[PDB]
C-alpha cells in the first residue's frame, strides 16, 4: 500500500515559517482587555523566587 510514494521538493526546500498565512483573529473588546491585563501582569511578575 503506497510503499513507494514521494512528495514535491517544495516540501523539503521551503524555508522556516514561509507557510504561515496572515489571518486576522477577531475577539471581543472584553477579551482584549482581559488578555492585555494578564500579559502586563505576567511581564511585571517579579523575578528571583520562581521567575
Amino acid at each position: 500500500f503506497r510503499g513507494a510514494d514521494t512528495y514535491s521538493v517544495k516540501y523539503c526546500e521551503q524555508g522556516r515559517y514561509e507557510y504561515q498565512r496572515y489571518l486576522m483573529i477577531n475577539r471581543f473588546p472584553s477579551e482584549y482587555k482581559k488578555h492585555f491585563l494578564s500579559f502586563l501582569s505576567n511581564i511585571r511578575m517579579s523575578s528571583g523566587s520562581a521567575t
Binding site: 500500500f1 514535491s8 517544495k10 514561509e18
Partner: protein, 101 residues
C-alpha cells in the same frame, strides 16, 4: 466537519456559495491531494518556490523495490496485532486499493 475537523467543504460538489466562500472553495482552500502543485504559500515566498512546486519527484524511472501484490486469493483485511509497529494507528482504517499497478 464541525469543531475539530479542518475540512471546510464537501469533497467534490456543494451548494452554491457566494463571495469569499465561493472564491475559497473554488480556488484558495487547501487541496492536499493535488498531484501537480502542493498547497500554495503566501505571496512573497510563492514566487521563489514556483519552480520547485511542480510534479512530485523529478525521477520518472523509479524501480519498484519491495513486495509484489497478491492477485489470488485476494484478501479483504490486513489487520494483525503488532508489537513494534509505531505506525499502526495509520496501518488501521479502511483505505482505497487504487494505485499504479
Amino acid at each position: 466537519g464541525g469543531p475539530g475537523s479542518p475540512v471546510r467543504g464537501p469533497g467534490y460538489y456543494a451548494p452554491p456559495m457566494e463571495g469569499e466562500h465561493q472564491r475559497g472553495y473554488t480556488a484558495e482552500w487547501r487541496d492536499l491531494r493535488n498531484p501537480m502543485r502542493p498547497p500554495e504559500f503566501p505571496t512573497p515566498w510563492e514566487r521563489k518556490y514556483r519552480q520547485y512546486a511542480r510534479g512530485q519527484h523529478p525521477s520518472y524511472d523509479m524501480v519498484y523495490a519491495g513486495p509484489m501484490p497478491e492477485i489470488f486469493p485476494m484478501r479483504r483485511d490486513f489487520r494483525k496485532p503488532t508489537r513494534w509497529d509505531f505506525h499502526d494507528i495509520e496501518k488501521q482504517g479502511k483505505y482505497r486499493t487504487s494505485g499504479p499497478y
